[PDB]
Structure 1
Amino acid sequence: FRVNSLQERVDRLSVSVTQLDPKEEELSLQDITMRKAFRSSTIQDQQLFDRKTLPIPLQETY
């Protein structure tokens, strides 16, 4: 699923980049003033041994 979702995401970005025009691209200071800075994902996995993570086989033995 993820692969397919990403592939189509990659494909249309490969097209968007094609349309990029350095000659017309204008820069504004409102990005530094009115628009938040890019933030990469900061997900950290924890509590890996909750009962809900217990595999079915062991659950039955339990």
Structure 2
Amino acid sequence: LFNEAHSFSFRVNSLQERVDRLSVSVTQLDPKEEELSLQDITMRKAFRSSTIQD
């Protein structure tokens, strides 16, 4: 139980670092800075979620 909970704690701390970084990044966005490229819309790699199965 201690080993598994310690691994869970590592994961929680890592995601907390990630979350604070994401928040500080998101609190800087600017609507006028946004530029949309019609040509690059499909030239862009598509995002896919993890699909790991045990």
1-side partners of 2:37 and 2:20: how far apart? 28
Please, which runs of 5 or more residues in structure 2 have no aligned partner? 1-9
Runs of 4+ in 1 over 3 A off after TM superposition: none
2-side partners of 1:32 and 1:24: how far apart? 17
**Deviation sequence 1:2-59 (CA, Å, 0-9, x none):** 10000000001001101100112111135433221110000011xxxxxxxxxxxxxx
SS of the aligned residue for 1:32 comes to helix
Please, which runs of 5 or more residues in structure 1 have no aligned partner? 46-62
Q: CA RMSD in A?
A: 1.3
2-side partners of 1:42 and 1:4: how far apart? 23
Number of matched pairs: 45
Identity between Structure 1 and Structure 2 (%): 100
2-side partners of 1:13 and 1:30: how far apart? 28
Computing the radius of gyration from Cα coordinates, the structure with the larger value is 1
